Amino acid sequence: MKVSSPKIQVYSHYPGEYGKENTLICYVSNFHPPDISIELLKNGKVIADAQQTDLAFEKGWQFHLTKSVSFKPEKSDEYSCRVKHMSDNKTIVWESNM
C-alpha cells in the first residue's frame, strides 16, 4: 500500500471578473486511498451548499472529485479550497488570473 497525495486545482468556470455571478471549482485528483475531506472557503469560513461529485477514478486507479459552488468574487473577499487527505491538511487560494 502507498499513499498518493491529491493534486488540487482551484479555478472559476468563467474568468473571475469582480461582481459577476460565477462558479468556484476545486478539482481534486490523482489520489489514493479514497477517503478525503474537501471544503470551499470564503474568507476562511466554510461555504454552505457546495456540491461534490460522486467518487470515481481514472485508468491507473487514482481517484478524482470535484467540489463546486456558486460565487460572486469581489475585491475584499478571499476564496480557497481546503483538502484533508490521510493526516495532511492543504489550503489552496483561488487565483483569478485577472
Binding site: 479555478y11 473571475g16 489514493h32 486511498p33 477517503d35 467518487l55 477514478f57 470535484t66 475585491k75
Partner: protein, 275 residues
C-alpha cells in the same frame, strides 16, 4: 462518433467517511448512474436515463449491485489476507466497459486493482487473466477454471454494446452536442503575463495557440491542463509570458480552435480587475 459505457466500482474495508461499496456508471465519461451500500439503491444521474428507463430497470440494477457489494466484501477479505494485512484501510477496485467506434467496431476492458495497484486484467483475445503479482495468480487459476473470462467477454462484446446503443439513442442530443468555447484574454497587470482562457466547451479536445505578427509563436508559452467544469463542459488556458515591451512592439494574439472552427483574441480584448 465513438461512444463508451463504463462502470467503476470502489470497495473499501474499515473506512467511516465512505461506504463499503460505491458504483458509478458513465457514458462518454459522464456519470448516468450511482449506487452505494449505505442507500442500497441504484439511482439515475441524467435526464436522458430518467426519461427512458424506470422502476423495473432500476430494481434490476439495484439487485445486480447488491450482489456486487456482497462479492466485493468477500473479495477484499481474501486479498488482504494474501498480503498479510489484517489491519488498516484497504481498497478493492473494478473498472470495465465497452466502446463502440463509427465503423461499428467495438473494444472492451475488464480490470481489478488492490490498494490502487493492478491485480488481474482480462485479455479477451486469449480468454485469460493477467496476474500482476503472485497474490493474483491464485485468482487467475480459479477464474480460468470458472470460465470468468468467457462470461466477461460475452458481456463486453454483446450485453454492454447493446445497452450502450440504447443509451446513445436516449441521450443523442446531449452526447452528440458541440458547444463552442467562450474565450477571453486575461491580464492581472499591464506588465504581467497574458492568459488565454477557454471555457464551456464540449467535446473536451481544444487547441490553444499564440501568434506573433500572424505567425505561430511557441516561446514563453505555458499551456494549462484540460479541466472539468461543474456542468459537464470543459475549460483550458494558455499563458504567454513576454514583456509589456514585446507586447507593445508586436501584434500578439491567441487562437482557440475547437471542432474545426477558430476564435481569435487580441490586445484590444484584454480584460482585468481593478483595471
Amino acid at each position: 462518433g465513438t461512444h463508451s459505457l463504463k462502470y467503476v466500482y470502489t470497495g473499501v474495508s474499515r473506512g467511516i467517511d465512505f461506504p463499503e461499496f460505491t458504483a458509478v456508471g458513465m457514458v462518454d465519461d459522464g456519470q448516468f448512474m450511482y449506487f452505494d451500500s449505505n442507500s442500497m439503491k441504484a439511482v439515475p444521474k441524467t435526464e436522458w436515463i430518467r426519461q427512458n428507463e424506470g422502476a423495473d430497470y432500476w430494481d434490476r440494477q439495484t439487485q445486480v449491485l447488491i450482489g456486487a457489494h456482497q462479492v466485493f466484501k468477500d473479495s477484499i477479505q481474501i486479498v488482504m489476507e494474501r498480503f498479510n494485512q489484517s489491519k488498516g484501510v484497504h481498497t478493492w477496485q473494478n473498472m470495465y466497459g465497452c466502446e463502440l467506434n463509427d465503423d461499428g467496431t467495438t473494444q472492451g476492458f475488464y480490470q481489478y486493482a488492490y490498494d490502487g495497484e493492478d491485480f488481474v486484467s482480462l485479455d479477451k483475445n486469449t480468454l485469460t487473466w493477467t496476474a500482476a503479482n503472485p497474490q493474483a495468480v491464485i485468482t487467475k487459476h480459479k477464474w480460468e477454471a470458472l470460465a470468468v473470462a468467457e462470461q466477461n467477454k460475452g458481456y463486453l462484446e454483446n450485453t454492454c454494446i447493446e445497452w450502450l446503443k440504447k443509451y446513445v439513442a436516449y441521450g443523442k442530443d446531449t452526447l452528440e452536442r458541440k458547444v463552442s468555447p467562450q474565450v477571453s484574454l486575461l491580464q492581472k497587470d499591464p506588465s504581467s503575463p497574458v492568459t488565454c482562457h477557454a471555457t464551456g466547451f464540449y467535446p473536451s479536445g481544444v487547441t490553444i495557440t499564440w501568434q506573433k505578427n500572424g505567425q505561430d509563436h511557441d516561446e514563453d508559452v505555458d499551456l494549462g491542463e484540460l479541466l472539468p467544469n461543474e456542468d459537464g463542459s470543459f475549460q483550458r488556458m494558455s499563458t504567454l509570458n513576454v514583456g509589456p515591451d514585446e507586447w507593445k512592439n508586436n501584434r500578439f494574439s491567441c487562437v482557440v480552435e475547437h471542432q474545426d472552427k477558430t476564435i481569435r483574441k487580441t490586445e484590444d480584448d484584454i480584460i482585468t480587475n481593478f483595471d
